[PDB]
Amino acid sequence: PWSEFRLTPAEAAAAAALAARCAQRYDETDGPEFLLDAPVIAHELPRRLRTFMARARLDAWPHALVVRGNPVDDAALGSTPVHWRTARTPGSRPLSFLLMLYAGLLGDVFGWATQQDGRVVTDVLPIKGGEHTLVSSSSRQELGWHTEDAFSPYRADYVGLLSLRNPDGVATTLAGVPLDDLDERTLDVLFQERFLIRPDDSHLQVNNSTAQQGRVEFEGIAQAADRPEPVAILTGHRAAPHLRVDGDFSAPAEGDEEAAAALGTLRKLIDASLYELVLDQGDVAFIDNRRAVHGRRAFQPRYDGRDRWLKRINITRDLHRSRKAWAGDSRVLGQR
Ligand SMILES: N=C(N)NCCCC[C@H](N)C(=O)O
Secondary structure, eight states: OOEEEEOOHHHHHHHHHHHHHHHHHOSOTTSHHHHHHHHHHGGGSOHHHHHHHHHHTTOSSOSEEEEEOOOOOHHHHOSOOSSGGGOOOTTTHHHHHHHHHHHHTTOEEEEETTSGGGOSSEEEOOOTTOTTSSSTTOOSSOEEEEOTTTTOTTOOSEEEEEEEEOTTOOEEEEEEOOTTTOOHHHHHHHTSSOEEEOOOGGGSGGGSOGGGTTOTHHHHHHHHHHSOOOBOSEEEETTEEEEOOBTTTEEEOTTOHHHHHHHHHHHHHHHHHOEEEEOOTTOEEEEETTTEEEEEOOOOOOOSSOOOEEEEEEEESOGGGGGGGBOSSTTEEOOO
16 A cells, blocks of 8 residues: 565665765755755665656555665664654764655655754654653554644645664554545545644653743644644545544544544544554655554563664645744744
8 A cells, every 4th residue: 555666785875875975065964955955966866766756756546655675784873862862873864864865855854843852854762761652752552543743734745754773573554544434424524624633742842852842832832732723634535535633632623523423433444444564674664644644553662772763754745835834944843
């Protein structure tokens, strides 16, 4: 149910060399200079990869684009960080550049003023003490399926994930719209503005650095949690709908029992059709955040220096869509 590409060793080496050159010439991935240049530098990537990315983005069916075979040397990478705060390590640096180059072929990268301190390239790794939370640094508790940043109209079109290491083969989960099982009445209701979707816990002050917790953009998050506006779960074409839902942060509109039944049914059908994608070391996935929800299976964290670790990036097809929320400015979204 996804589109897959495997780099030849020569293609993988060339992409890696390009990323290393970028890491040599630019101070950081999230600086204005590399943010502007990366999409044009990405034109230098191996042609067969550029062809795959251009065409697979235009296919109607895939839930994700997956690129296999980027080499990662665990000795050069170093230990998995204890927290995302300290995760911009020299060993991970070139792979962060690599992810952004790949992302530049699909759209405009951006971050949130209220998530991981406004970073564009973010980290997914288990944090000691946070095993049973609702954020991506969880482990022992499964990360429930979700549209990334479901609460926001400016949420990503694609979510990029690059596996730095995943020694125990922990699966990312995915599901599309269960169109084979949704009856027309239920479908009709899911297309109506009868649902509430609150921001997830990654946007809370407690999950950002103490220095950031006075930022005005947390006000907007509070407003969205306290007074969510009713929206639709499904949009667009009835035979191939786009999806906006989060299994732990969605609810029906107040007292709307038909909407509740529709969401209840959708939960069961998504639970039933959820499938696994294992991102091995060096694998990159770009998840279609309109066609699919995603999550991550429960796993026992190691905390020994070799935990599963991904770099992540949010991608939009059009940054100008979010101008009302430009905060840091165009590339870091948030509102009062
Ligand atoms: N059903 C759940 N858990 N929803 C929230 C998922 C985590 C989202 C957030 N971007 C993060 O990286 O933590």
